[PDB]
Write a protein that binds this ligand. Structure first.
Ligand SMILES: Cc1cn([C@H]2C[C@H](O)[C@@H](CO)O2)c(=O)[nH]c1=O
Ligand SMILES: Cc1cn([C@H]2C[C@H](O)[C@@H](CO)O2)c(=O)[nH]c1=O
Ligand SMILES: Cc1cn([C@H]2C[C@H](O)[C@@H](CO)O2)c(=O)[nH]c1=O
Ligand SMILES: Cc1cn([C@H]2C[C@H](O)[C@@H](CO)O2)c(=O)[nH]c1=O
Ligand SMILES: [Zn+2]
Ligand SMILES: [Zn+2]
Ligand SMILES: [Zn+2]
Ligand SMILES: [Zn+2]
Lengths: 178, 178, 178, 178
C-alpha cells in the first residue's frame, strides 16, 4: 500500500538578498508583529530567544506544540537537511520564516537558499544600494585590501564591512585566472 | 505662453498600514541601506537625524543639494501641503520615503496618506498579525477600558498599546449610535 | 445604545497605475485563477460576464449569495459611493478586486482610487515602460496633435493610444498658463 | 594575470509558481508594456514572435544588438546551461524575463528554477486558488483517473487540466510506497 501524511496549513516565508540589504532586520520586523499578537516565536542561527545550532535537524529538539513561529537567520550556512527540516515544520502547521543570502560573493546561488526559495509559499528578495554608483544593488562584492576577490578564493568566509560591499551587477567585479 | 518645469527622476516610496505593522522599522531599514552606501539622508517627523516639524513646508528649510534621501514618518499627521511638498521634492531629484497609517481607528482613510499612495511611484502596504484571531490584520482597533471606541470619538488621539490593537476586518469593531 | 455590524473576512485588492501598465490584464489574470478553482465571479465596468453600471450602488442589484468574487475595472470613473460599496461587499465576505488609474494626466490622484488604496487589504501598483526613455513609467502623458495637454484641459477625456502615452516623471510634461 | 569582464546593467526577472497561477499571462503582460514603448522583444520556449529551442545555448543564435528584452517561458524544462545563458544575457545588457514552475508535482524544486530565483534581481512568485478548499494554492497536484500520483511516477509529464490541479499544501497529496 501507499502512505500519505496530511500536511497542515503552515507555510514558509523566505527573505533573501545580498549582504547589507536588511534581511535580518526584516526577519525581526516580522517576528515582532508576532509578539504584539502574543504568539510564541523562536529564532534559530548557526554559529523570543535566538538559539545557535550546528545541524538543521537539531531544530526539532528545541520546538514545542505551544510555539507558533519559527524563524531561522543566515540560512545559507545551514546543512543539507534544511530543506526537509523546514518542509516538515511547515507541514506540521508552523509559520516558518527564513533569512539568508541568495548569492555568494561570485554571484552564484548560496547553499540551500535557492531550494528554499523554490518550495516557499512566499519569497521576498531585498535590495541594498550600490556603494560604487548609488543604484539598486543585487550582489555582495568581496574586497581584500581594496581589491576584488578572485573567483577561486573560498566560498565561505565569515566577515562584515571590513571585506564586503553591496553592488549592482555592473559594478560587481569577480576576476578569474586565465 | 505656457510654463513647464522639467521634473528630475527623483521618486516617492510610501510605506503604510495599521499601527503595529512595522512601518517605522521598515522606514529605518530603507534609510539604513542608504548609509551603507554613504548617501546623505534626513528623517522628518511631526511632534542621520530625526527632525520635528509643525508644517509640511518647513521641510524645505532643512534641506540641501548635498542630501539624497528624505524620509518622513507618521505622515497621516502632516498638514494639507504634504502632497505638494513631496511632489516637489521628488521633482527636484530626491528619493522621498514616507511612512504613515492608511486608516484611522474607524477603518477610514487617514489624512493625506491616500493621496500620497496615489502619486507615489512605489507603495508598500504592511500587515500586522490580528490580536483576536492570529490571522493577517489590516485595521487598528481602538479600545477604551477594554471597550471598542465609538465611531464618533475624535479622529486624532495620540497613543500606543494602552489604547490600540491590530485586527483583521472580521475582528475590527467600530460601534455607531442609532 | 450603540450598533455594531460584524464584518466577515472578505477583502479588497486594488490594482492601479498609469494607462498601459496592464491593470485590466492583471485583473483578468486574477479572475481567471478564480475559474480554475470553480468559484463564481462577476466583473463590473462603467460605460464570467462583464456588466456595465451607471452608479456604484447598482452593483448590489447584480449580486448573489452564490457569488464569491467581485471585480470592478476602470474604478477612477466610479461615483462617490464606490468606497462604501466595496467596503460593504468585503464586509459581507466577498473577495473584491478593483482596477483603475492612480493618477489623471496631470499626475494628480484620480477619483476615489486613493481612498480605495487606503482601505484595501492589498494594493498592487503596476508600472509601464516610458515611451520617451525606456525606464519605468509612473505617469500617463496626454498629447494633443503631438503636444502635451495643458494643466487646465478637462480631467476626464475617454481615449487610448491616439492621445495617451506612459512616461516616467522626468519625461512627463504638464504645462501651465502663467 | 586575472581576467575581468565588465557586466552591463541588464537584469533578470523570474516569474514562478504552480501550474494555473498565470505565469505565462504575466510574462506576456510584461512583454506587452515593452511593445507600447516600442522596444524590441523576443520570447523563447522549449518544445514579437515565440521561438522554440532544444538547448539553452541555441538562444544566442536568435539574438541581436537591436533587441532589448528576452523572455523565456516554461523554464523548468530548459537544460543545465540556462543559468549561465541568462547570466550572460543580463551581463550583456538585456532585460531577461523568465517564467516557469517553482515545484514539480511532488512539491520538490523544479529544474534550474531555484538557481534562477537565486541569481535574479527580481523574483515574483504567483499563487493560484486551491481547487479543494478555495484558499491560496502553492502546489500542483497531479491526478491520474482522479487519484493522486505517487512520489515515484516520472518527474516530467506534459499535460494540462486533464491531469493537473492547483492546491494549498494542506490539500496537496503525494503518496509514497512503504
Ligand atoms: C557574500 C558572502 C558572504 N559570506 C559570509 C560573510 C558573512 O559572515 C555572512 C553573511 O552575513 O556570510 C560568505 O561566507 N561568502 C560569501 O560569498
Ligand atoms: C488608529 C489611529 C491612530 N492614531 C494615532 C495614535 C498614534 O499616536 C499614531 C500612530 O502611531 O496615530 C490616531 O490619532 N487616530 C487613529 O485612528
Ligand atoms: C490619464 C487619463 C485617462 N483618462 C481616461 C482615458 C481612458 O479612457 C481611461 C483609462 O483607460 O481614462 C482620463 O479621462 N483622464 C486622464 O487624465
Ligand atoms: C507539476 C508538473 C508539471 N509538469 C509539466 C506539465 C505541463 O506541461 C508543464 C507546466 O505547464 O509542466 C511536469 O512535467 N511535472 C510536474 O511535476
Ligand atoms: Zn553600481
Ligand atoms: Zn481577527
Ligand atoms: Zn522617461
Ligand atoms: Zn486547499
Amino acid at each position: 500500500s501507499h502512505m500519505y501524511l496530511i500536511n497542515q496549513n503552515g507555510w514558509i516565508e523566505v527573505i533573501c538578498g545580498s549582504m547589507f540589504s536588511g534581511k535580518s532586520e526584516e526577519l525581526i520586523r516580522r517576528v515582532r508583529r508576532t509578539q504584539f499578537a502574543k504568539q510564541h516565536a523562536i529564532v534559530f542561527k548557526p554559529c523570543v530567544k535566538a538559539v545557535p545550532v550546528s545541524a538543521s535537524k537539531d531544530i526539532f529538539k528545541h520546538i514545542t506544540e505551544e510555539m507558533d513561529v519559527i524563524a531561522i537567520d543566515e540560512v545559507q550556512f545551514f546543512d543539507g537537511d534544511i530543506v526537509e527540516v523546514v518542509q516538515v515544520l511547515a507541514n506540521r502547521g508552523y509559520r516558518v520564516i527564513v533569512a539568508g543570502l541568495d548569492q555568494d560573493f561570485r554571484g552564484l546561488p548560496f547553499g540551500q537558499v535557492p531550494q528554499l526559495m523554490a518550495i516557499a509559499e512566499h519569497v521576498t528578495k531585498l535590495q541594498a544600494v550600490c556603494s560604487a554608483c548609488g543604484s539598486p544593488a543585487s550582489r555582495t562584492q568581496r574586497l581584500i585590501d581594496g581589491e576584488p576577490a578572485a573567483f577561486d578564493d573560498p566560498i565561505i568566509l565569515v566577515g562584515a564591512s571590513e571585506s564586503y560591499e553591496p553592488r549592482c551587477r555592473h559594478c560587481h567585479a569577480v576576476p578569474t585566472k586565465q
